[PDB]
Amino acid sequence: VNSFSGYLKLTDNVYIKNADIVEEAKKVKPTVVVNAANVYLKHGGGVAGALNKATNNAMQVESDDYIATNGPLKVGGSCVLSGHNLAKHCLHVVGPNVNKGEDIQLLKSAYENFNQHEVLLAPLLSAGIFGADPIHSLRVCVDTVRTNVYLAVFDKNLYDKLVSSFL
């Protein structure tokens, strides 16, 4: 038993809710919240900008030190940093950005990072401003992640489309 509430169960291990991931993180305080990161951990907009704003820019300060030490992430890669006031940990995961021409096949590699964590609160990778089809992202999620994932979809219209079209 865990504290996630109001989710629709899609599969054995994948759950979905129309929710603001920032507000969901603030209430649940999950062990892991996933950020829709880029390779530079520049949290300017989308999910990343919202998560970072909710940390009062502490996420960005920590991220800048991480990059100064380690260099950029790989597309499809991840790193574990603090969850600040939102979660114990933040798993920064880089899905491919279609608006930059990155290979969509890397979306499966991106979701594989979730398997290193027993339970996660997450957005749909490569959705939103990353330009992928969220229905495809949900399919890859279901077919790749084996650990327990609670997906938060900000847009109610999109949420209904994702549920109604789910196979």
Ligand X SMILES: O=C(O)[C@@H]1CCCN(C(=O)c2ccnc3[nH]ccc23)C1
User: Which residues here bind ligand X, judged by CB under 6 A?
Assistant: 20-22, 46-47, 50, 123-124, 127-128, 152-155, 158
Of 74 and 156, which has the nearer Cβ to ligand X? 156
- Quote the CA–CA distance of 10 and 104 in Å, as a whole number: 23
For residues 140 and 103, is the Cβ–Cβ distance under 8 A?
Answer: no
Q: Nearer to ligand X by C-beta: 70 or 165?
A: 165
Least distance in angstroms from the C-beta of 68 to ligand X: 26
- The SS3 call for residue 105 is coil
Report CA Rg, the chain: 14
In the complex, least distance from residue 70 CB atom to ligand X, rounded to whole angstroms: 25
Residue placing its CB nearer to ligand X in the complex, 6 or 71: 6
CA distances from 75 to 60, 63, 72, 126, 157 (A): 19, 16, 9, 11, 29
Q: What is the DSSP letter of 75?
A: T
To ligand X, the closest distance from the beta carbon of 69 in angstroms equals: 28
Q: By C-beta, is 3 or 157 nearer to ligand X? A: 157
- The CB-of-165 to ligand X minimum distance in angstroms stands at 15
